[PDB]
């Protein structure tokens, strides 16, 4: 088969703890190519953590990440492992494994394939159900939406009229405050208030499905 670098799922950790993320290589001789681990935060750009030769076991680390990340290799199952120690909310980021080909002039001259990325979220808060807050003002096309406040973890979906309404559906990016997330959505309906609209939300981790009518004056 073609070269692939599969990775584990998203990991939610606790501050001060340790996590281990695995990158499984397939489709090529594992010991012949370096495996490099690279960071990416949302605010900043990509940051290179280190690399490891699976064959000889030689590892190199970035100066900032030395003593925080540790790279190991299991050659029997052909899998690289990266361990984060003493986790802090700084380290909430997406980590990638890259298959670096060996070179002549430099140690690595190519970075062919990358893993799909593992999202590591460091937060002391536990999972909490959202508390949706419908709100309406009190032209024919009037904006409508609800406020989703105080949920954890990050992934959650908002649906408008159980999918019946799909005109100008704006799910804004969620921000973090006091260790909890808040969400806002908007929609324009010219049939308001003759046709009622519902605020369908669904938290997958909390297994909560809430439908709320906006109501309001008028």
């Amino acid at each position: 088969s073609q070269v692939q670098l599969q990775q584990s799922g998203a990991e939610l950790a606790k501050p001060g703890s340790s996590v281990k993320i695995s990158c499984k290589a397939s489709g090529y001789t594992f010991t012949s190519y370096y495996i490099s681990w690279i960071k990416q935060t949302t605010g900043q750009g990509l940051k290179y953590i280190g690399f490891i030769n699976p064959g000889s076991g030689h590892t190199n680390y970035n100066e900032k990440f030395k003593g925080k990340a540790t790279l190991t290799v299991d050659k029997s199952s052909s899998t690289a492992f990266m361990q984060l120690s003493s986790l802090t909310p700084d380290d909430s980021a997406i980590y990638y494994c890259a298959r670096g080909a060996g070179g002549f002039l430099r140690i690595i001259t190519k970075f062919d394939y990358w893993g799909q990325g593992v999202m590591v979220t460091v937060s002391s808060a536990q999972t909490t159900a959202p508390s949706v807050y419908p709100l309406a003002p009190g032209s024919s096309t009037v904006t409508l939406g609800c406020l989703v406040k105080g949920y954890f973890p990050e992934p959650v979906t908002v649906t408008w009229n159980s999918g019946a309404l799909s005109s100008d559906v704006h799910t804004f990016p969620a921000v973090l405050q006091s260790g909890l997330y808040t969400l806002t959505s908007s929609v324009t309906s010219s049939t308001w208030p003759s046709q009622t609209v519902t605020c369908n939300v669904a938290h997958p981790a909390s297994s909560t499905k809430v439908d709320k009518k906006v109501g309001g004056s008028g």
């Binding site: 690279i38 900043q44 750009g45 990509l46 940051k47 290179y48 190199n60 970035n62 100066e63 430099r106 690595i108 001259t109 970075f111």
Partner: peptide, 12 residues
């Protein structure tokens, strides 16, 4: 991304 010296630096 440069790969000349070991602390590989990415752009913004």
């Amino acid at each position: 991304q440069q790969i000349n010296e070991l602390p590989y630096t990415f752009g913004a």
